Ligand binder design. Structure first.
Ligand SMILES: CC(=O)N[C@@H]1[C@@H](O)[C@H](O)[C@@H](CO)O[C@H]1O
Ligand SMILES: *[C@@H]1O[C@H](CO)[C@@H](O)[C@H](O)[C@H]1NC(C)=O
Lengths: 227, 104, 107, 109
């Protein structure tokens, strides 16, 4: 007897714009739910539930229920209840999930010089800090084309030790040292609800970084009153 | 190259480049190429000459990567108004500090 | 920073015409020979009536509002190390120079 | 650089890569004795996106901005089995970023 309801995610409303309440019922002997339903406080119905899974290898069945909702059907402060039924409990089981901010800061950190001296793979990192709530998505784009998620990883946001309202996390992309020698776009695209456009890219290349040799060539004359 | 702070008010243009060096490893160089073009003989309040001579020249590489400034642009104009007696009646007349830049 | 290089040839009997962009502003339009010895620019003809003493009566200018163009025409060329001539507009010659050219009187 | 301009508190990042066994330990030594556990936060070990069976981790120390211009060490020590002595540590300071020779020209005619 395992019943749960999960809300949508920001990583799906930005990637595909497909907000939807999901209701996962498993471990029930005969049937998880002969009839999935989703209800709201105002008594609004939902759409169909499909893509039912086969029985588990552990002699039990899996079932899923879908509530395809509007984009604003989760930011208006309302509850959702997943009506599920079984054969041993005469009462239709119920479960409820609802919704409860500060702008983040993105920082690029250049790969350490020591690993550049080893010439296998530099790890570029983009730190996202001070975001509230912990609702940040991170992806990496090269030359305008995104990279596969198998190349970069993102940390689960943790609360700040000093500012519990704030949250912090990061993402890292491994690249061959030589490629970073030649250089690429290396864009860390970030997506948090506390963003104007949902958009705050920052990027890095071999061109930028710690400058090891300046040369200033400031000039002086006496009539350039018109730069 | 990478210098999108060509603001011709404070004259700055600090571009970036990477020494495609001698073909060793990525022992590369990162540069910051400033060229500030001081007017030095200009006036403090850029649109009014009655202000004293501008002696100090402050240069922050933060505001010049976009305000009072030092020189005149060819695409912008700065003007002034002047009086005169000619007897009793005094009439404001319009002059332009930047000729061949905003001449009617 | 434009370089409209032109390679007109002219002998003593040959006349050389130089084409310059006319902004139609009419405040001042000029040609300026850059001075190799001094390292600066030296005006030769302008909107004003002044003309080089060595070049008196040998160079003239034509304005074409129909085509928005400026013509510097030299009737006679006396084997000058025809350096770099810059077309320009405005009173300040060094700041107003738009295009620069250089050619050869001999061949 | 951009973090250092907020003039508040800087973050040091300690990154460990390429270790096969999990459960690495990370501590922050401050030129002598250790620091309180709430002054730093360490994550879990996740698998390497590039390496098949290697892991990585990451730890963050938050300090005041003014402490850098004081000139303290704030070194990171890590313990794992595969190390030759089971323990190693690194350090970094404001004196590490400054090394760079300048270059100045200044004509006035
Ligand atoms: C002094 C200056 O303005 N620029 C110098 C340049 O003359 C020199 O060739 C180069 C070599 O390191 O360093 C920089
Ligand atoms: C700055 O350095 C580059 C390469 O090191 C060099 O080509 C350039 O001439 C230098 N600039 C000045 C003003 O010396």
């Amino acid at each position: 007897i395992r019943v749960f309801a999960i809300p949508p995610s920001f990583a799906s409303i930005f990637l595909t714009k497909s907000t939807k309440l999901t209701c996962l019922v498993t471990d029930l002997t005969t049937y998880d739910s002969v009839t999935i339903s989703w209800t709201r406080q105002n008594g609004e119905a939902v759409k169909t539930h499909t893509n039912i899974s086969e029985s588990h290898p552990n002699a039990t069945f899996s079932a899923v229920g879908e509530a395809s909702i509007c984009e604003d059907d989760w930011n208006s402060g309302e509850r959702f209840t997943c009506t599920v039924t079984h054969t041993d409990l005469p009462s239709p089981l119920k479960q409820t999930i609802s919704r409860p901010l500060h702008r983040p800061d993105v920082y690029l950190l250049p790969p350490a010089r020591e690993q550049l001296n080893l010439r296998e793979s530099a790890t570029i990192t983009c730190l996202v800090t001070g975001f509230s709530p912990a609702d940040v998505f991170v992806q990496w784009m090269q030359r305008g084309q995104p990279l596969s998620p198998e190349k970069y990883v993102t940390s689960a946001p943790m609360p700040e030790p000093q500012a519990p309202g704030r949250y912090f996390a990061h993402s890292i992309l491994t690249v061959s040292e030589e490629e970073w020698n030649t250089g690429e776009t290396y864009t860390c695209v970030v997506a948090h609800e506390a963003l104007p456009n949902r958009v705050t890219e920052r990027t890095v290349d071999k061109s930028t970084g710690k400058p090891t040799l300046y040369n200033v060539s400031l000039v002086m004359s006496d009539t350039a009153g018109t730069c | 190259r990478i210098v999108l702070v060509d603001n011709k008010c404070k004259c700055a243009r600090i571009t970036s480049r990477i020494i495609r060096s001698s073909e060793d490893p990525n022992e590369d160089i990162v540069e910051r190429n400033i060229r500030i073009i001081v007017p030095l003989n200009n006036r403090e309040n850029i649109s009014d000459p009655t202000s004293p001579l501008r002696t100090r020249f402050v240069y922050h590489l933060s505001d010049l990567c976009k305000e009072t400034c030092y020189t005149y642009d060819r695409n912008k104009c700065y003007t002034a108004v002047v009086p005169l007696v000619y007897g009793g009646e005094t009439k404001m007349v319009e002059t332009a500090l930047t000729p061949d830049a905003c001449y009617p | 920073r434009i370089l409209p290089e032109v390679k007109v040839e002219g002998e003593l009997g040959g006349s050389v015409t130089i084409k310059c962009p006319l902004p139609e502003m009419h405040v001042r339009i000029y040609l300026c020979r850059e001075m190799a010895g001094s390292g600066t620019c030296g005006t030769v003809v302008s909107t004003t009536n002044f003309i080089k003493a060595e070049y008196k009566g040998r160079v003239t200018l034509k304005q074409y509002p129909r085509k928005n163009l400026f013509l510097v025409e030299v009737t006679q060329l006396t084997e000058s190390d025809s350096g770099v001539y810059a077309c320009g507009a405005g009173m300040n010659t060094d700041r107003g120079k738009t295009q620069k050219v250089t050619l050869n009187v001999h061949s």
